[PDB]
Design a protein around this ligand. Structure first.
Ligand SMILES: Nc1ncnc2c1ncn2[C@@H]1O[C@H](COP(=O)(O)OP(=O)(O)OP(=O)(O)O)[C@@H](O)[C@H]1O
Ligand SMILES: Nc1ncnc2c1ncn2[C@@H]1O[C@H](COP(=O)(O)OP(=O)(O)OP(=O)(O)O)[C@@H](O)[C@H]1O
Ligand SMILES: Nc1ncnc2c1ncn2[C@@H]1O[C@H](COP(=O)(O)OP(=O)(O)OP(=O)(O)O)[C@@H](O)[C@H]1O
Ligand SMILES: [Mg+2]
Ligand SMILES: [Mg+2]
Ligand SMILES: [Mg+2]
Lengths: 104, 138, 433, 159, 485, 117
């Protein structure tokens, strides 16, 4: 759904250009997360948010260093949110579908 | 007595209720559907619809129906047949879908994998009603 | 010429794969598979790890070849370390696999240095007592799918339980043609299995087949004075892209995509040469391959139609047009003879001898025997001996009625008869309806 | 090194039989099929080929006389043992009974036991078992020929 | 005398036929069976698989991890353990007869828990606080005949070897008539209980009805794969005798699977080995190399396995497969043979989880010849046209011929048509089937891609796709010639 | 079926040859090795009782099976067909190759009680 990914990318952060690139990422990363990363009924309510934050780091490292993002938008405990997002990065930010998504 | 001396006087009426709750797995389809994610719920809905229209259906025909529904509706991204089968076994692990192995009754009768459902329709449709992105599959 | 005889015998040995083990030919597109098998075997025979793995590929896709090559390679350096139990799913049943394992265990342990004696219960108990440094037992189990039946997979359960929980090192190599072999397995059997499935490589592109032909036909040892000239001739033919070998290899790649199919034609090309010049002329022209392909198609529908007599052709044409006019395609001897006599009268009215009904019976039986007609709704050859036995203890209704009322269906139709009967044949206008 | 006889209209077939059938087991296929309809000279060409090469050891079986698979297995065991007894009469042998073959596995065991007592021979030889009319078996199924295809892989390789 | 048929391979065991009811002349004539030299358990094959080790094998940095993650080597099962142990201990100490029903999915620790219970019970009996008992293990899938359990259990009790019927009345006499003071308690593990289910259901009734006898002192621990087995397959008598109490072994959560894998990786993870750079052999404490397997990789594998099955066998095998992928890459890089930090990364775990998911069927259909792809294309065209799941082979022949003769102007069809119908040769007449038609038909039948019915007329015989239609479509339009037309 | 006809025929043959004077396979190879097991020639007379009730495809295939024993010099075979309908009735329920086979040496004889009164 476009509204959930749009709201999640929005409140992780702070049209159809770079925020559109970010939305497209969160969606692909979330869809492959649904298949290869399994969460219980609590952690599942932040599957979009965590995925959104991952895409944010990619922007901060690839094209725009000036982009800002903060962690506590994730509706879990910040230690638990940290552990889950490290798990998500290390697992499927190097996945073969998520390698030719042009970030420019 | 087993539960009374595993959890530690005249024993109470509550231990009888504890016996009748411990050895009756009163699992609800409410609790089973609520432990799934959106993709397992979607594949459960497509399985239900394929068995509604065919009722002697294989894994592969249900995957064909899932592909047709997911290209008609365009929700997330379509899955490959083995990922579909893995989510079907996940639904076995949850206890909503069973995959058996049975003979066909056509002109070419061989053994195939078959989907049966052991869940009741009313609370299934009630749980799937509350999700807006699933009602094209109901 | 003993030199040409030595060259011919070496070429035939390379084509049959019967070279010594240090000279055996592994195709380029086959290293990545065989190294993987070379790992698993060497992790079991040498390092005493228990493994179970299924090879999946079509028939004649070098499963047995690579496995036999691996076992013969490990035989020459680690001979006392392992024994081999070979089972075949066609030959061994669920009961006789136990006796096969026991007999092979006894005869292999008497070869390295009883279980086999008694009833089947005692034999199975002695096997499980034996199998539940150490000697690695290597199971080569061809046709894994026949023992992966839906009723009860007892042997697969016991063998994968041996791989998992026994302290005897066991290697199991199943082999099958079935692509979805993992879905054949029962839940406990599938759980005990490692779920390691190796899919055999296919030919992907044309110069894989060209390089495999080059590896098959290049003599890499100096055993004949004709070796260098043969190698130059073969390289000249295989490098020229308009040569007859490259045309036949391309044809195989686009139709069969099978190197055993190519070898079955290349072997009598080599073996029918009398001298070296005849062999070079044969490998340039490839004229024998066309004669081979003509002979491999000599007994299909077209050649059997060309072997027919004029009355046989007339009866077949009449049966074909009666079958075309029918709804279910069914016909008998009476309607076919009526069509035949109308056709002969309409020919002679515009002189062909009209044969009597008592003589067309022999032609009809010859046409049934030559697989031109089949009995209506006939199963034919059954899949297994049990269904064949059940069919043999039953008398079908077709064999109790007279022969002129038996319903038949056509193996060839009137359009194909019109296509492959020549224009100048005088029964041709009867191929249209 | 084989003699190609003259058959009047089966010259290609006789050349192919010279290509495939030889005394050397390395350059001989494990299975060879001659396919043709009735009265096409299959038996005639095979007899003229084997008569012109007397050093080739052939055993002839007619499956039409055996009718079922179990007498075919027993006939294979009996005829192979009798031919190997006639061929090398100065080799002492245990006489295994043909009637104890009731499974293809038992045929594999009996052929193993028969062939393991001829290792005193100096050269590798071929034994050509000719099943003249395999599909003329009366009780034929689709699974029988597969066992005969895969039979050679259960026998020893250095025999 | 001439026989009508012969049985020349009869193998009969040396089993007597007289049951235990006729050993002694009276009930009082039976001695205390615990003092008999043959009763109650009172191998010769282990040396047959010994050889001489004349080599020195190399065990690398990941060798100890792969050897230690095997199923041969009880954290998450402590309530089930307590339930089984307390029921069996109360049944032993009071001299009672009791059925304990345990059910569950594969690999959730049922056999392991029951075996740990009987080891603690035997240790407790060794300290003389409960009376001594005999432990019998009967696996239904390890029997040739289902009645052989009658053969097994009685042979474990008396040491005699009888046929199954005489063993059955021997066990009935022993459990009912012999008094408690002359007997010993027997704990029987019936494992794979469904494998011992027959049409008569006599074995089920006998084994659970002996637990209702006053003198029996029999404890039957039955392991099932489902909890609804006595209602679905067994009668009301056997269901009543099994009882209302039924212990279910749930699938492991990912915390429990992670605890199991971390319990096997204690002493090896975050440790140092001495590694030879010349051969590759590594010794637990020349270079000092630290071995790690990351906890994120274990938690990913545990979460995936817990959602799919909750199976400890699959979690251990996925971890071992990841370590083997890492160790294969290690031997490829350093050139080691089979005679500062090494890590099993998360990428190896993802590769191990994806190698059973990658759908080789599409790849197999992509790497086929043109004739097989043309057959599949024609069959798919017929399913699109007339909407049937089964198509006659003559229709496939006719539509292949139509596909060749309509799009002739394609350059590939002008190249291939003489090959398809004459094998590129004059003096070969035009063929009714294509070249290699039966070859590709039998090849697709061998793979399980196709189903063919059993008819002797080759034209009216039906062919059905056994695989899904969408994967056949994507394999077909991967091909550049077939997607062009 | 043909298999039962051959099995009963070979069992009767072995029983008679043992009664007239190790076990064997009840197939036609017993006819092949008859001189090696009993030292005498073989004359087989087949009495087909009630041919108007037998399955004609099975009888045809049994006659084709019995044709295979003609390559043995020690064997001669007689066939007796007990007919109550007509010769042409059995002539049109057999294949023409079998009719050509039976035509080489055949005789007819009337058996019925109204033979010349
Ligand atoms: N031991 C061997 N030595 C030499 N050549 C062999 C050997 N085994 C097989 N071949 C050849 O290798 C080729 C491939 O056939 P192979 O027997 O390996 O098939 P396969 O893949 O095991 O198939 P199937 O599933 O039918 O068993 C054939 O040409 C065969 O003759
Ligand atoms: N090329 C030939 N030259 C001479 N005579 C021949 C030739 N071919 C066949 N014959 C004769 O025809 C007879 C029939 O041939 P043969 O028995 O070999 O046929 P077949 O194909 O084996 O038949 P079937 O399958 O019916 O047994 C031979 O016995 C022989 O007399
Ligand atoms: N709690 C556990 N702690 C450690 N290892 C365990 C545990 N549970 C299972 N395992 C491992 O899994 C293996 C398989 O478990 P087990 O044989 O008990 O399964 P099961 O539930 O009886 O399965 P099946 O139904 O297939 O027989 C054990 O041998 C052990 O290696
Ligand atoms: Mg093979
Ligand atoms: Mg012949
Ligand atoms: Mg178990």
């Amino acid at each position: 759904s476009m509204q959930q990914v749009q709201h999640c990318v929005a409140e992780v952060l702070r049209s159809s250009g770079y925020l559109k690139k970010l939305t497209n990422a969160t969606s692909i990363l979330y869809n492959t997360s649904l298949n290869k990363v399994m969460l219980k009924q609590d952690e599942e309510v932040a599957r979009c948010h965590i995925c959104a934050y991952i895409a944010s780091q990619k922007m901060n490292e690839k094209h725009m260093p000036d982009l800002c993002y903060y962690i506590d938008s994730i509706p879990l405990e910040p230690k638990k949110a940290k552990h889950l997002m490290n798990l998500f990065r290390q697992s499927l930010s190097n996945s073969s579908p998520m390698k030719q998504f042009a970030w420019t | 007595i087993e539960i009374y001396e595993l959890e530690k006087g005249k024993i109470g009426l509550n231990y009888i209720a504890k016996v009748f709750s411990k050895f009756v797995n009163n699992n609800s389809t409410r609790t089973r559907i609520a432990k799934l994610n959106i993709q397992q719920k979607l594949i459960l809905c497509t399985i239900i619809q394929s068995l509604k229209l065919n009722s002697d259906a294989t894994i592969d025909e249900s995957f064909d129906h899932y592909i047709k529904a997911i290209t008609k509706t365009d929700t997330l991204a379509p899955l490959q047949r083995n990922e579909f089968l893995e989510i079907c076994t996940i639904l076995e692990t949850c206890g909503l879908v069973s995959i058996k192995k049975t003979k066909c009754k056509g002109k070419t009768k061989r053994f195939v994998d078959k989907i049966d459902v052991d869940l009741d329709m009313r609370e299934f449709y009630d749980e799937m009603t509350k999700i807006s992105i699933l009602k094209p599959f109901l | 010429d003993p030199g040409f005889g030595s060259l011919q015998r070496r070429l035939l040995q390379q084509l049959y794969g019967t070279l010594p083990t240090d000279e055996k030919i592994i195709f380029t597109y086959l290293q990545d598979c065989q190294q993987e098998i070379d790992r698993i075997i060497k992790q079991s025979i040498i390092q005493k790890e228990s493994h179970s793995v299924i090879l999946v590929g079509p028939r004649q896709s070098y499963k047995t070849y690579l496995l036999d090559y691996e076992l013969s390679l490990l035989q020459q350096s680690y001979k006392e370390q392992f024994i081999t139990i070979r089972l075949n799913g066609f030959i061994h049943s669920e009961q006789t696999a136990i006796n096969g394992i026991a007999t092979q265990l006894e005869q292999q342990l008497q070869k390295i240095h009883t279980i086999s004696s008694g009833s089947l219960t005692e034999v199975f108990e002695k096997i499980l007592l034996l199998l539940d440094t150490k000697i690695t037992v290597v199971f080569i189990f061809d046709e894994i799918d026949t023992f992966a039946g839906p009723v009860r997979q007892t042997l697969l359960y016991n063998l994968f339980d041996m791989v998992e929980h026994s302290r005897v090192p066991v290697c199991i190599f199943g082999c099958t043609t079935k692509l979805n072999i993992l879905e054949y397995l029962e839940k406990r059997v599938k759980s005990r299995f490692s779920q390691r499935v190796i899919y055999m490589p296919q030919i992907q592109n044309l110069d894989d087949m060209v390089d495999a032909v080059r590896n098959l036909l290049t003599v890499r040892s100096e055993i004949s004075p004709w070796v260098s000239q043969w190698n130059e001739t073969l390289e000249k033919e295989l490098s020229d892209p308009r040569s007859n070998l490259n045309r036949h290899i391309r044809m195989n790649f686009e139709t069969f995509r099978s190197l055993p199919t190519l070898k079955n034609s290349i072997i009598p090309l080599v073996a029918t040469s009398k001298n070296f010049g005849s062999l070079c002329t044969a490998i340039k022209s490839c004229s024998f391959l066309d004669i081979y392909n003509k002979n491999q198609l000599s007994n299909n529908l077209t050649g059997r139609l060309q072997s027919l007599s004029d009355l046989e052709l007339a009866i077949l044409i009449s049966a074909a047009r009666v079958a075309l006019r029918a709804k279910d395609g069914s016909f008998n001897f009476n309607l076919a003879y009526a069509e035949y006599e109308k056709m002969i009268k309409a020919i002679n009215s515009r002189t062909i001898k009209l044969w009597l009904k008592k003589d067309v019976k022999n032609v009809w039986e010859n046409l049934v025997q030559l697989d031109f007609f089949t009995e209506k709704s006939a199963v034919g050859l059954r899949d297994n001996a049990t269904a064949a036995f059940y069919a043999s203890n039953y008398q079908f209704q077709g064999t109790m009625i007279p022969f002129d009322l038996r319903s038949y269906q056509m193996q060839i139709i009137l359009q194909e008869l019109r296509r492959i009967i020549p224009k100048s044949n005088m029964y041709y206008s009867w191929t249209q309806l | 090194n084989v003699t190609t006889p003259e058959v009047a209209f089966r010259e290609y077939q006789t050349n192919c039989l010279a290509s495939y059938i030889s005394a050397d087991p390395d350059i001989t296929p494990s299975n060879l099929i001659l396919q043709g309809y009735s009265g096409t000279g299959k038996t005639y060409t095979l007899k003229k080929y084997f008569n012109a090469n007397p050093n080739l050891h052939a055993v002839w079986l007619e499956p039409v006389e055996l009718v079922s698979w179990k007498p075919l297995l027993q006939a294979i065991a009996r005829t192979v043992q009798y031919k190997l007894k006639t061929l090398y009469p100065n080799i002492p042998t245990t006489d295994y009974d043909p009637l104890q073959v009731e499974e293809p596995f038992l045929l594999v065991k009996t052929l193993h036991n028969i062939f393991v007592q001829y290792e005193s021979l100096q050269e590798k030889t071929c034994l050509f078992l000719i099943l003249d009319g395999f599909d003329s078996l009366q009780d034929l199924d689709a699974a029988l020929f597969n066992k005969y295809i895969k039979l050679n892989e259960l026998l020893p390789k250095d025999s | 005398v001439i026989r009508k048929f012969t049985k020349k391979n009869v193998a009969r065991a040396k089993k007597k036929y007289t049951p235990f009811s006729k050993r002694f002349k009276s009930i009082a004539a039976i001695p205390d069976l615990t003092s008999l030299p043959e009763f109650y358990g009172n191998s010769r094959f282990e040396n047959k698989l010994k050889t001489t080790q004349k080599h020195q094998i190399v065990e690398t940095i990941f060798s100890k991890v792969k050897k230690q993650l095997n199923s041969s080597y009880l954290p998450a099962r402590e309530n089930e353990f307590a339930s089984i142990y307390l029921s069996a201990y109360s049944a032993i100490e009071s001299d009672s007869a009791t059925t304990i029903y345990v059910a569950g999915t594969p690999g959730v620790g049922k056999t392991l828990t029951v075996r740990e219970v009987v080891k603690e019970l035997l240790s407790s009996s060794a300290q003389r606080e409960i009376p001594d008992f005999l432990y019998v293990e009967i696996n239904g899938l390890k029997m040739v005949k289902p009645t052989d359990c009658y053969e097994t259990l009685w042979n474990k009790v008396s040491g005699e070897r009888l046929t199954w019927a005489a063993s059955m009345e021997s066990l009935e006499f022993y459990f009912k008539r012999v008094p408690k003071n002359k007997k010993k308690t027997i704990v029987v593990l019936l494992d794979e209980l469904d494998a011992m289910v027959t049409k008569s259901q006599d074995i089920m009734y006998n084994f659970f009805n002996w637990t209702t006898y006053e003198n029996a002192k029999l404890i039957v621990i039955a392991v099932a794969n489902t909890m609804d087995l006595p209602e679905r397959q067994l009668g009301n008598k056997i269901t009543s005798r099994i009882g209302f109490t039924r212990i279910m072994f749930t699938g492991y959560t990912h915390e429990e699977l992670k605890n199991i894998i971390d319990l096997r990786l204690k002493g090896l993870n975050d440790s140092f080995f001495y590694v030879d750079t010349k051969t590759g052999n590594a010794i637990l404490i020349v270079r000092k190399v630290r071995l790690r397997m990351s906890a994120d990789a274990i938690e990913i594998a545990s979460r995936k396995v817990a959602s799919v099955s909750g199976d400890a066998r699959r979690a251990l095998k996925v971890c071992k497969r990841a370590a083997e992928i890492a160790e294969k890459h290690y031997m490829a890089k350093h050139g080691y043979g089979y005679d500062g930090v090494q890590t099993v990364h998360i990428t190896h775990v993802m590769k191990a989880l994806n190698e059973t998911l990658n759908s080789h069927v599409i790849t197999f259909m992509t790497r086929l010849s043109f004739t097989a792809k043309l057959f599949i294309y024609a069959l798919l065209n017929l399913m699109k046209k007339n909407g049937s799941q089964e198509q006659e082979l003559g229709d496939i022949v006719d539509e292949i011929k139509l596909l060749i003769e309509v799009n002739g102007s394609n350059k590939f069809v002008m190249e291939i048509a003489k090959t398809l119908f004459q094998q590129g040769s004059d003096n070969i007449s035009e063929q009714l089937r294509i070249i290699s038609w039966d070859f590709v038909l039998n090849q697709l039948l061998d793979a399980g891609i196709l189903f063919k019915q059993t008819m002797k007329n080759d034209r009216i015989c039906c062919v059905k796709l056994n695989i899904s239609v969408e994967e056949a479509k994507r394999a077909m339009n991967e091909d550049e010639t077939l997607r062009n037309l | 079926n043909v298999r039962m006809m051959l099995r009963r025929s070979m069992y009767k043959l072995y029983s008679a040859a043992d009664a007239e004077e190790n076990d064997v396979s009840y197939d036609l190879s017993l006819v092949e090795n008859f001189k090696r097991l009993f030292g005498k020639d073989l004359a087989m007379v087949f009495n087909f009782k009630d041919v108007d009730s037998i399955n004609f495809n099975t009888l045809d295939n049994f006659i084709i099976l019995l044709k295979s024993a003609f390559k043995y010099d020690h064997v001669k075979i007689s066939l007796i067909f007990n007919i109550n309908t007509n010769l042409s009735n059995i002539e049109k329920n057999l294949r023409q190759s079998t009719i050509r086979l039976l035509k080489r040496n055949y005789h007819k004889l009337d058996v019925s009680s109204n033979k010349g009164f």
